[PDB]
């Protein structure tokens, strides 16, 4: 179903609050994003990890140069956090992603996997900044 | 759902500070920050 898959969808507004928070390769790795390719067609890709691009760009108020190593079945390349869209996974794009996964052979993640992964973002959002992370964030 | 927004001292940038947290700006890092105007009905009489 698309409604259940949209739960872990990392919109463009949420990613602005973890631009420098540690454990970014742990809480982010596992969720899906609606990266815009470009005309209105979108392709869902899996978050394999985290990379850093040599180009610095401004995203509204803040500004980040980190990239995002995504992959859609087999086709993989470097992307940016600025092309991500805030729209939810439509039926057509959901079917396209399912077909791409079936063709690539990657087993679809289990519903319990998504159920236990969606809580990661929720628990990270209310995380108290009691440790020595503000120094690194400001740096 | 009010995280008690504050205003940095010199940055004049908004910050979200919750209880049991250090008082510092999200960037640079200073130790001074003021509050924002209330949302109440501040109504004066031009007298």
């Amino acid at each position: 179903l698309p409604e259940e898959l949209n739960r872990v969808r990392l919109s463009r507004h949420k990613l602005e609050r973890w631009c420098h928070m540690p454990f970014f390769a742990k809480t982010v790795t596992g969720c899906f994003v609606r990266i815009g390719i470009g005309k209105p067609v979108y392709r869902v890709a899996e978050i394999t990890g985290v990379v850093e691009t040599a180009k610095v760009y401004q995203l509204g108020g803040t500004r980040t140069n980190k990239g995002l190593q995504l992959r859609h079945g087999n086709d993989q390349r470097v992307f940016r956090l600025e092309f991500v869209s805030n729209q939810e996974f439509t039926e057509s794009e959901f079917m396209k992603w399912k077909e791409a996964m079936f063709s690539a052979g990657m087993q679809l993640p289990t519903l319990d996997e998504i159920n236990k992964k969606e809580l990661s973002i929720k628990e990270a959002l209310n995380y108290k900044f009691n440790d020595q992370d503000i120094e690194e964030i400001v740096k | 759902q009010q995280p008690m927004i504050y205003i940095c001292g010199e940055c004049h940038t908004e910050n979200e500070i919750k209880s049991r947290d250090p008082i510092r700006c999200r960037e640079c890092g200073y130790r001074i920050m003021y509050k924002k105007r209330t949302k109440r009905l501040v109504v004066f009489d031009a007298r």
């Binding site: 919109s11 815009g36 940016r80 869209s85 805030n86 729209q87 | -």
Partner: peptide
């Protein structure tokens, strides 16, 4: 205050660049 999208702010594309 999770995501005040209200759509969005014109999301750029990859091939457009």
């Amino acid at each position: 205050t999770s995501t005040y999208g209200r759509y969005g702010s014109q999301t750029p594309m990859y091939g457009s660049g």
